[PDB]
Amino acid sequence: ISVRGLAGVENVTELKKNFNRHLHFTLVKDRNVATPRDYYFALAHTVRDHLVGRWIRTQQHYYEKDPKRIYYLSLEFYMGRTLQNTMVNLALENACDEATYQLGLDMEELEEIEEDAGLGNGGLGRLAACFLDSMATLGLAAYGYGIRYEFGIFNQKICGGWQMEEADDWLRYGNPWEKARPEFTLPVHFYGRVEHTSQGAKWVDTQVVLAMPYDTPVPGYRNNVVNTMRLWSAKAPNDGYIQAVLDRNLAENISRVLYPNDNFFEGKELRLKQEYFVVAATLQDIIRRFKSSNFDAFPDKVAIQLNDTHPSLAIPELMRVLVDLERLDWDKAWEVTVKTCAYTNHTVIPEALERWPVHLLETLLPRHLQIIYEINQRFLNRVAAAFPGDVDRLRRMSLVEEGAVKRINMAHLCIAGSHAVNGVARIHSEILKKTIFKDFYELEPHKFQNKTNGITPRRWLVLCNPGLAEIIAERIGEEYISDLDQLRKLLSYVDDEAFIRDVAKVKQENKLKFAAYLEREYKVHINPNSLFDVQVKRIHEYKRQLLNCLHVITLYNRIKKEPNKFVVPRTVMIGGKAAPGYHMAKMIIKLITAIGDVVNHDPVVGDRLRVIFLENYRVSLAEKVIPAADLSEQISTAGTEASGTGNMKFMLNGALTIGTMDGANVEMAEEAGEENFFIFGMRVEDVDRLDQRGYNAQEYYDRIPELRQIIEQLSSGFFSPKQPDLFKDIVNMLMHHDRFKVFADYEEYVKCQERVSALYKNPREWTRMVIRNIATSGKFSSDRTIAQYAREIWGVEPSRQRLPA
Amino acid sequence: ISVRGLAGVENVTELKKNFNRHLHFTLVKDRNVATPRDYYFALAHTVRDHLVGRWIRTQQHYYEKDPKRIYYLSLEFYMGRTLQNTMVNLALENACDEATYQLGLDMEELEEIEEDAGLGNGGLGRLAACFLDSMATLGLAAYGYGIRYEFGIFNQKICGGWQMEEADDWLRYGNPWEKARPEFTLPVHFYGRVEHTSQGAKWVDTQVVLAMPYDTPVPGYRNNVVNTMRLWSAKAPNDGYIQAVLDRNLAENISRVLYPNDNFFEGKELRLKQEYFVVAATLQDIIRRFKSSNFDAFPDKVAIQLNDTHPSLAIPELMRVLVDLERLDWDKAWEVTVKTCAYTNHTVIPEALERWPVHLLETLLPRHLQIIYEINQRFLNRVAAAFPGDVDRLRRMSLVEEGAVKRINMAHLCIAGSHAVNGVARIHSEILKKTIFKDFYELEPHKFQNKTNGITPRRWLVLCNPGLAEIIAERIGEEYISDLDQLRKLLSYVDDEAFIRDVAKVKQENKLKFAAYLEREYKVHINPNSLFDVQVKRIHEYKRQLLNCLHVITLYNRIKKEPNKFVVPRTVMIGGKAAPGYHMAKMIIKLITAIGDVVNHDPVVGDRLRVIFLENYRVSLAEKVIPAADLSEQISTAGTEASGTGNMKFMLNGALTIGTMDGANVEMAEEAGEENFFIFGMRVEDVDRLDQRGYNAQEYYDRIPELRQIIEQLSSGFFSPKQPDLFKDIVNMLMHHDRFKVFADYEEYVKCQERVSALYKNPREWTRMVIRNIATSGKFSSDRTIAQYAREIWGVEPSRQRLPA
């Protein structure tokens, strides 16, 4: 396979000797006692060595050229594994494959040993990861800044059909990719009081926590650029004896674990400490670099992108430093701050928005609270001048929300202090301007933008689906890997009998590969000839895994009704983690496994229908299941999924999509053509009209016999014999308080699914439609997304120019 | 200097290239941004590389030959720095010195960057360190097993003349010498209950803590042998969500910090957990290795040495495994256990002996308590049979002590379960048999032995005093470095005018070197021509730093009395850490600094007398001050210092000794000749006669005018103007409840000190006496000590044979 680079004779010879050198000197092992894990580490260190030279000169280059620096602040970076990605970007895959083969090792086996760097929950964290890859590939002087959690997203275990959370001790065996930089440790302050003396305010009597950075290299695609992702780790200062030392933990707990609540905002103190910790340490680094290049030029040399409101404290912290430390006057500092910061929103659902209780900020960050009040005061004076007499607008736009307990709306703070605010899909960005942020849009229209999300074609095509990447390259070259729009050239092959056959062959190979994996590491057997129907993403009511469940039960009931009637065989796979304290989400997981227990053991069904719950869904599993999927389920209620990115991964890998006109689904259908998409359900307008009228689920239950039967089955204990009322909460929610209108889209969903089965019966036409999707997936490359951020927000020009080394 | 090895052309060339390779690939740095610390690490990794090959084959060799293995269990390993020691033992010092010189670096400057591995309190921990060096040098298949404390002995800061404790974060910048071995992690159990079912007892419902090993290489002196020191680190098993993860700390606190109480036993639960933790993990390793070589041969392949009673749980744990797990019958298991274990005692003072409350063992280690009761039962049945009717002997020898709260005497447990029990100096070993362990000696005389302590001549001569090592080698060769008895050949040079001059020259150079250091890193100026009077060791009442203080004040008062009378100039240095909760010890430190504040600023005294308190005494400081000392203070009350080892370090480095006939001082004087030692004070017999009579301090106060004046000065606030009664506790203790009879040895001490000053006035005779001490210090090499342990206790023969690589 040519897209994996050349396997030169002296290159292979060099890799082999460095492999054995590391096994000996680095790992300190005998070839007679080395285990597969030891071999993985020897390979990792060998590949890491190749990154060093490039990493050192890339950073040296930025010091010389002194270009504008882009700082991407995120509390999450869902990186996954690093070995194969590094080989791919350095063009070392075939060489390492040959070198290891000659040493009597299977590189694929070694790659499976690496732990995932799961420092994220899902979409938001993975977007940050794809963005880092694209920024390096486009030659931007970019830095990713976050927290080095000792424990990432929990490993999910399914016990008795229930989710069990297990600590993700990903650093147990060490992390060969990172480099600790203790010499660059910085002070972060907490608590204390604010002294107001003759010349300015002073924040004193604070407790100090040190921030120690760990740097991880981020290689661009074959351009010799290697940027940095710097993650901070918490350390206690060195200044009963025993208890005093043991209490050092308290300070170090700040970077101990990733918060897994991606659905409901909880104003926990530890989370606020994490947010300030990353912001305070990062900003000192930014200013340091700047002073080594008049803060008037600060915005010309620095761009700070806030991934959601999680790092929003960057705004008042920048003000604190400029005003309290650098001594700039307020107006000047505010000008600099606004021109430097930009904010990206990822959801319109209210329960996820950060609204911190004032009493918490009052105790932990007294000076920042004062700064926020001043910002609010000046901002509202602006609103009052623009909309005289509109007192209600004043209360609505305030950064401070009154009521039971006063809270600070962090989204309002971000809009006021950013020169750009963006949604992540066209429909989402429009909804922001028409609803949630309407008042702000009317005040400052120029600030609102759209930047449709994307995914990196390196990890999501070349790395996880080499077979498809190869057959594509055979016909249009390899240039598309860094210019995905070139995939449009494949439309001229839609009638090519050879190509149609190859596309279908690779998909079949991926399905057999995954079906085998399912038995090896999970002992479950599936029919490779069935349609692989998959929905993988975090469990949320808005994502409607429940609607999928209703269809599965419908299919099952129809079979029990007419057993000898032919139906297209299906393997329905659903996977995803539920936030620990999200009761309903945990009940849905139990429902899925319960359905499987019934369906998978019914003799009449045979191998015509299988329901499997994919355990511990994470980046490394996504790389395995996505290339094997036939049907991608993207069925969120219209207006709820900001963008979605998994949808893009499926489109690029040869799966057809069944979904609502929500998030990026709208743009995907626009690019490929609605005829090549399985669209169904209410549009956003329909949802609003239903809300005006009032959603009454009982209506659908009374008019749809098939739906009624399912609800009765759930209620009577058909799927829970030993515990008849096990799913009472689910039924109760669907019937009386379903914010996401599951029943409203049921009929159209089922009908649409029938059209999917009909097309699958015609192999040739199914594949031709697949080609039309792959061919038009170009717009969804994160390289396109990053280019827009660069030109329209950060003010820099991307570069595909190879670096000097 | 020839004893530093050869600096070959291609050897130097190789070191240089590997140095730059590590700076680039390992540290990931620019030569334009590298700091001294970066250079130190590059050098360390370069030297470490040379250890690897030898380390791997040494361990491979033991697997092949399968010799009897020696396991040295200690909760303390006071290692100090590792770089220079490694170079010395590998004969790479001159080569590295040349290589670094050519790179434009000063190797001495780089060596000062390394942190000390301070995993010990003092003598006991440092003995373990010297023992590891000697066992490797003598070719024994030995393993050091302990705990990898994240925080070693605290760094001592002197604030306002008071000791302040600062956490010793020695791993902050990383430890290049160790190699984590997560793949060899083992389970350690705590709490739980004991089930008694049909076939044997069962320990169930326990809480598990994992023990992760870290291995550090221990190189022998130029024999290519590299043994291992394996230190265990505590890890929590992976099986509110957030709080559950944060609570993992609780389990990991076991290996967090070294207990600094080397004076008073405190039955703290955390300390007991540490003791079992090291024992449980170590024993699994021992058995594993054994089964890979009938437990009847266990004692022929394994020897376990217990450094004090700290790891005494090894006895009942070995029984637990043999009986409960391997299913051996009690008597057989006990036979194996006794033949495998040996115990070393380090003190006769009662407050330091471990006597664990039964209720603590009952909760934490229920099965071990049962085993201890059974051991006690069977042991006492033996005593009853040997001494029929002696009921009092029964209560005295019991492992269980009655009273307020029942406790387990760990020393009694060690004697019952060991085939050998030894003291650490002849006088100490005799005292054990006549007093503290008299009953046990009468029951089993064959178990009691003596093994006089020693120090390694590599670190304590070659490494810290190259100048002296060189002038010695010039005349008798270099063979003495691994056969210290050869120093006796120097007696033929006692009248050699050339040698006398060189010995005196090196001492003068060391004093100027130390005097300079005192100003550089401490800004205090001293007179290099004065007699360097030094007492460095942990602060304890029994060590009598107070007696030294009384002499200093006496000297000061005599000068104020006759200012224009000539007196031999002196620089009195006292250093050492005080256990955190040892009030009296902390008061003595304050007293020393207070005396300095007065004496050091008195115009009349001039540079005739200076009192300096050496801050943060530790191994690296000992290596600096000892070679610069003229007079070694070893003045413990006769019968209290088991052996002492600092005394041996001073003797080997050209200092004369003033001390009591206590511990090893007795043997040192015997070897060098009493005429070449400044002996004074009560012998052990005198102390007992005084106790019979009753020690009344008032008697000395009334009969000695000079002493009375000092006490009155302390009481009146002469040394504490602002706080007149600051030292009331000290005076009160000296006058009414001094267990160590400070006043009783005052007169003889002062008189002896006068004879010291008299000899110092005759440079030539002082030096000749010095030569007689150095020449007879051979017996105190730890190589001699280890050879005796090997032959008389472990049953193995030492070997000076170079290894094959």
Ligand SMILES: O=C(NC(=O)c1ccc(O)cc1)N[C@@H]1O[C@H](CO)[C@@H](O)[C@H](O)[C@H]1O
């Ligand atoms: O993944 C998240 N959000 C979180 O994971 C999250 C984590 C911690 C929180 O406190 C709140 C949300 N949002 C997701 O970010 C993706 C990239 O823009 C979008 O495509 C998805 O539509 C959106 O739901």
Ligand SMILES: O=C(NC(=O)c1ccc(O)cc1)N[C@@H]1O[C@H](CO)[C@@H](O)[C@H](O)[C@H]1O
């Ligand atoms: O150093 C100690 N003891 C401790 O450091 C200690 C540490 C923790 C404890 O719980 C009790 C004692 N003992 C010392 O061990 C040396 C080597 O045998 C002897 O030469 C000294 O005379 C003796 O006092």
Ligand SMILES: O=c1[nH]cnc2c1ncn2[C@@H]1O[C@H](COP(=O)(O)O)[C@@H](O)[C@H]1O
């Ligand atoms: O003062 C300096 N002199 C020379 N090079 C420097 C200096 N400061 C930074 N650099 C270079 O710039 C890189 C960027 O470091 P950073 O951005 O501060 O982490 C460093 O690794 C050096 O190559």
Ligand SMILES: O=c1[nH]cnc2c1ncn2[C@@H]1O[C@H](COP(=O)(O)O)[C@@H](O)[C@H]1O
């Ligand atoms: O099963 C085995 N086969 C070959 N060599 C072994 C085996 N077990 C241990 N060794 C060798 O013995 C050394 C001792 O390992 P340890 O004493 O168990 O830590 C290992 O590094 C290997 O060189």
Ligand SMILES: *Cc1c(COP(=O)(O)O)cnc(C)c1O
């Ligand atoms: C791409 C990805 C996501 C986001 O999926 P959506 O379906 O857009 O919610 C979540 N988790 C993982 C591991 C991913 O790879």
Ligand SMILES: *Cc1c(COP(=O)(O)O)cnc(C)c1O
């Ligand atoms: C040798 C040594 C000791 C033991 O000294 P003694 O005088 O025998 O108590 C204590 N601390 C350090 C750092 C040592 O090097």
